[model samples]
Target: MYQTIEGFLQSWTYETESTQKMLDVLTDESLSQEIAPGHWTLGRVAWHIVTAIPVILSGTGLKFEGETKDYPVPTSAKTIADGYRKVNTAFVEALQSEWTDKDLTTINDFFGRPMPNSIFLMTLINHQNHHRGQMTVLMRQAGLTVPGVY
Candidate 1:
């Protein structure tokens, strides 16, 4: 949980940038490569990360700036890369505008019973990181190099 807006913003910038670096290395052919059958490919994982921002922000009474559903899955790594850049830009702006340190302490019903907004925010970041780790594995499996460690 963050104690100040600056802390959250700074940390978020670093974490998101690290993830973007991973996104940057993907090639067109690597997008559809999966760990195995019936699993998320690199492209799907990237799309999920992009989509999840709006879902999690909705918990804080914020709406995504653009369309949320039926996003066309990328057939090429460039498309995914472009989507990642756009969504990440929107996410940072939304966080700066909609959230505050006080909001973090306010309780809300998330997942189940009431919980601090801080918990919700933390969960959002952690969830992204979890999937990002999975994407790293798939990147290696797809013969792509991993990005910098956060």
Candidate 2:
């Protein structure tokens, strides 16, 4: 769990940068890449990473700006990438301006169990990391150039 918002933000920034690098290399055509039919496409996964930001953080009583879900999976890779970029900035600024170190310790619902706001922040990072790794595999399968994440 995060002890400080600063620590979490640092990790969030680094992780999101890595995710951005991966997103930057994606092609619109590559968005259709999938391990199998009837499974999630690359575009779907990318958009989920973007949308899940607000969805997961909703449990923390934080307000996220703009449409977190409401849109169809975009056909354009840049749309997905740009969506991530916007939410990325919005989340950071909201957290910095609205939350304090004490807020990190505030307990909140995480799915069904009670968890700290810090845990929710960490969950955001972990959630992004999980999907980013999945995107790397999809990128490889799609024959796109995979960027360095670590």
Candidate 3:
């Protein structure tokens, strides 16, 4: 959990850049790579990392410029990568304009219990990292060279 906005922004910038590097390496053809016939695919996992930004953080009363409902999975890898970029920009702008350091400690329901907005912020980073790891495995299966992100 972040104690200061600047601290989180510093981390956010690096993490998002790392994520962008991964996204850039993705191929449209690789989007179809799946662990099973009807399971999660590389594209879907990638899109989730994009969309989950709004879906998860909105619970903390954050607003985003990106679409938050009924958005279909983009078929193009570039679309997914660009979408991530745009949404990250939107989220930073929103956070700067609408939130303060004190707001990070504001209590909100997460899952079923109360959680701090700081923790939600932390979860966003962790969640992206989690799915990104999944993408690396699938990318290997798809025969794409996974770029170094750490």
Scored by lDDT, the top model is 3
lDDT of each: 0.76, 0.87, 0.89
Instruction: Assess every candidate by TM-score.
Output: 0.87, 0.94, 0.92
Please state the error at residue 107 of candidate 3 in Å. 1.1
Over 1-150, each residue of candidate 1 has an lDDT whose tens digit, in order, gives 678778877877877888888888988788788868996677888777867777766666655574455256667777666777888788778767877778778887775678777777777789889989888988898888797575
What TM-score quantifies how close candidate 3 is to the native fold? 0.92
Question: Which residue runs of candidate 2 sit more than 4 Å off their true CA positions?
Answer: none
Error of 1 at 41 (Å): 1.4
- Between candidates 2 and 3, name the one with more favorable lDDT: 3
Candidate 1 displacement at residue 21 in angstroms:
0.6
Model 2, 30-146: lDDT tens digits are 999996888889998899999988888998988868457725899999988998899888888888889988999999999899998988887888888888889999999999989
Q: Please give the ranking of all candidate structures by TM-score, highest first, separated by commas.
A: 2, 3, 1
Best by TM-score: 2
The runs of at least 3 residues in candidate 3 whose Cα sits more than 4 Å from the true structure, single-residue gaps closed, are 69-71
RMSD of each: 2.0, 1.4, 1.6
